[PDB]
Amino acid sequence: LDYVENFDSPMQSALIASSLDGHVKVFDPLDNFQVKFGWKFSGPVLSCAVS
Amino acid sequence: FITSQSTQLFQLLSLVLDSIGLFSLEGALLENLTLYID
Amino acid sequence: KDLASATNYVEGNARVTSGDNFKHVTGTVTVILSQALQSNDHSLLETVLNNRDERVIRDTIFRLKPALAVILLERLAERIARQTHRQGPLNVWVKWCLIIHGGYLVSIPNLMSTLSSLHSTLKRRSDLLPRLLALDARLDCTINKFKTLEDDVEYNEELDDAG
Amino acid sequence: ILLILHKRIIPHFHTPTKLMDFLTDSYNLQSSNKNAGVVPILALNGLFELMKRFNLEYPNFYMKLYQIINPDLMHVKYRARFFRLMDVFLSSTHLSAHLVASFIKKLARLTLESPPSAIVTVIPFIYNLIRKHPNCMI
Amino acid sequence: QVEIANILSSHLEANSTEILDDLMSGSWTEPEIKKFILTKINTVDHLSKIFLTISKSITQNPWNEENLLPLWLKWLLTLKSGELNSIKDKHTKKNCKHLKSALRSSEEILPVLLGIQGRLEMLRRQAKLRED
């Protein structure tokens, strides 16, 4: 799980969470940590990070 | 009576069916009405 | 620019939208179907949606957990919206969901907000119907009317002179 | 069917994902017929192949697995097939000491009433587990 | 078939009121209707009379269960549209408008009705599932 804040996106803060099912999804803290985006990969995700 | 402008009446019939609800509707009658509309 | 000239119309980067845009107001694959819906795996679910067998469609949704049904309805609307040519197959899925989990769907606080995409999507297909029938009738009459409606003998002088 | 399902059936299907509901139902079968009590053992192999190939999941997998371990396991002729799959599952690097400890203690309990053939299987099987997870020397 | 075709031919010449009954004869079949209109309707007057009679009946009762007259109208127009609009009788045009008005309403009837046909379908199927 990784978190970034105060970046230039329309969203102020983003929360990215690995699933180990091939999915890493973006959650927004301001709206009660709700699902806003995600990506799929070939296999289980163990690590996720953003700049 | 409907089994025995009409679109407004049929629209009214559609309104009845929802107010009746899926439970209250009884199979024997519904078969006939299914035939009439068809 | 000449001041006499009238300014031209340019849409630029404006966002188009429609008035129906209510966003701000054995052999079964059930477990895969429940799996992908929970995890929002487009690749996994698309394989599930690839089945064209009606008996499979019924059996899969028959065992699907009723809460997961609602999100399935929402997602089919989106996949229909992006690709309308898949309208035919996907109504079947929406149909069998509706009849089996209809009792559950009744006991839901709100439906239109969560199923607005279907209603808008389904409405568009209806708006086509009156015009297509007119096209079919015109297309009917024409086909209806139209469905009802050397060397062997050659004589060459040169060859004859030759033989 | 289940015995040959993993090898002679799945690789030749065009969309093997269709088999899971059959396999999960097989893996979840509970019946009063004792001869049907071995079904989860056989169905497990095919299920794992599907999970490996397409990243598919079975809920509470280990808790279901802990249930399947029973004295009948030590006497069925399919014991060897089961343990082979157990080596793969219990080689996972995200297994807690308690989770491994339970599989250890239950198996040792079962070895008391087990054929020597099963005992010959368990004694090296346990040494691998204890070696893998050093905290369990207690 | 042949007898009714001749009878209808005679009545058309005789300006008989029984033309509707001849058209209402159940002996008519769709291939025969094509043969009659193509072969026997050679005069504009006969075409006008049939169209006036059939249109009047449908206008009076557009929802009649019997599909024969609608079959007659549909085949009459497809094969003799050029001759039909060639007719310059004012009454024929007036009869057309009346037929349009009744049929125009029927088109408005359909879209709500098709929903109701569906709306009953699940109630039947849902009832079947409960029985099972």
How far are the Cα atoms of D36, E18, E53 from residue E50, in angstroms, in the given order?
78, 11, 5
> CA-to-CA distance for C29 and D21, rounded, in angstroms?
6
Task: Pull the structure tokens for residue E85.
Answer: 């609009």
CB contact under 8 A, A21 and C43: no
| DSSP letter, residue D18 | G
Pick the residue from chain C with its C-alpha nearest to A38: C40
Q: Which one-letter amino acid corresponds to residue D76?
A: V
Residue of D nearest to A41 (CA): D55
What H or E segment, with its residue span, contains residue B9?
helix B6-24
Type of residue found at D30: Q
**Residue A11 contacts residue A29 (beta carbons within 8 Å):** no
Separation between Cα atoms, residue B31 and residue E128, nearest integer Å: 11
Q: Which of E71, E42, E30 is nearest to E54 (CA)?
A: E71
Is E touching A (3+ C-beta pairs, cut-off 8 A)? Answer: no
Q: Which of C102, C126, C145 sits opposite E122 (nearest CB)?
A: C102
User: Cα–Cα distances in Å, from C137 out to D92, D110, E59, E86?
Assistant: 67, 79, 20, 21
Say how far residue C101 (Cα) sits from the centre of its chain: 23
C94, C118 contact by CB (below 8 A): yes
Query: What count of CB pairs under 8 Å joins C to D?
Result: 26
CB atoms C102 and E125 under 8 Å? no
Using CA coordinates, name the residue in chain A closest to D57.
Answer: A21
Terminal alpha carbon distance of chain B: 17
Residue pair D62/D103 in contact (Cβ under 8 Å)? The answer is no
CB contact under 8 A, C27 and D54: no
DSSP chain C: --TTSPPPP--TTPPP--TT--S------HHHHHHHHHHT-HHHHHHHHT---HHHHHHHHHHS-HHHHHHHHHHHHHHHHH-GGGHHHHHHHHHHHHHHSHHHHHS-S-STTTTHHHHHHHHHHHHHHHHHHHHHHHHHHHHHHHHH--GGG---HHHHHH-
Distance CA C7, CA E42 (A): 63
**Which chain C residue has its CA at the smallest distance from A18's CA?**
C39
Q: Residue D23: closest CA among chain C residues belongs to which residue?
A: C26
Rounded Cα distance between E75 and C145, Å, is 10
Chains D and A touch (3+ CB pairs under 8 A): yes
Cβ–Cβ contacts within 10 Å for residue E99, how many? 19
Contacts with E111 from chain C: Cβ below 8 Å: 126, 129-130
Would you list which residues of chain C are within 8 Å, Cβ to Cβ, of chain E? 98-100, 102, 126, 129-130, 141, 144-145, 148
Residue C145 is nearest to which of E78, E125, E126, comparing CB atoms? E78
Residue E14 corresponds to which tokens in the numbers above?
């005789």
Largest Cα span, chain C: 104
Cα D62 from Cα D85, distance rounded (Å): 12
Method: cryo-EM
For residue E5, how many other CB atoms are within 10 A of its CB? Answer: 19
Nearest CA in chain B to C103: B22
How far lies D29's CA from each of D51, D68, D129, in Å?
19, 11, 29
Q: Give the residue among E58, E48, E54 at the shortest CA–CA distance from E102.
A: E58
D55 neighbourhood in chain A, CB within 8 Å: 21-22, 43-44
Pairing of strands A34-40, A2-5: unpaired
Residues of A in contact with C41 (CB under 8 A): 21-23, 40
3-state secondary structure of D4: helix
Find the farthest-apart pair of alpha carbons in chain D and give their distance in angstroms, rounded: 50
What secondary structure does DSSP assign to chain E, as a single string? -HHHHHHHHHHHHHT-TTHHHHHT-TT--HHHHHHHHHHH--SHHHHHHHHHHHHHHHHH-TT-S--HHHHHHHHHHHHHHHHHHH---HHHHHHHHHHHHHHHHHHHHHHHHHHHHHHHHHHHHHHHHHH-
CB pairs under 8 A between A and C: 13
Q: What region, left, alpha or beta, does residue B25 occupy, with left being phi > 0 and alpha being psi -120 to 50 degrees?
A: beta
Asked if residues D138 and D97 have their Cβ atoms less than 8 Å apart, the reply is no
Nearest to B7 among E108, E119, E120 (CB): E108
Q: Establish if B19 touches chain C: CB-CB under 8 angstroms.
A: no
Residue B11 phi, psi dihedral angles, 5° rounding: -55, -40
Give the three-class secondary structure for D122.
helix
Question: What angle is formed at CA D16 by the lines to CA D12 and CA D17, rounded to 5 degrees?
Answer: 175
Residue A40, chain C, CB below 8 Å: the answer is yes
H-helix or E-strand spanning residue A5: strand A2-5
Q: Is C38 on the interface with D (CB under 8 A)?
A: no
Which of D:88-127 have CB within 8 Å of A?
none
CB contact under 8 A, D22 and C31: no
Residue pair D63/D28 in contact (Cβ under 8 Å)? The answer is: no
Contact D20 C26 (CB under 8 A): no
**Alpha helices (H) along chain D:** 2-8, 20-27, 39-54, 61-68, 71-75, 79-89, 97-111, 116-132
Give partners of E (≥3 CB pairs < 8 A): B, C
Contact C148 E126 (CB under 8 A): no
Subunit contact E122:C99, Cβ cutoff 8 A = yes
> Quick one: how far is CA D81 from the chain centroid?
8
Q: Which amino acid, residue D119?
A: I
Enumerate the residues of chain D whose CB falls inside 8 A of the CB of residue A21.
55, 57
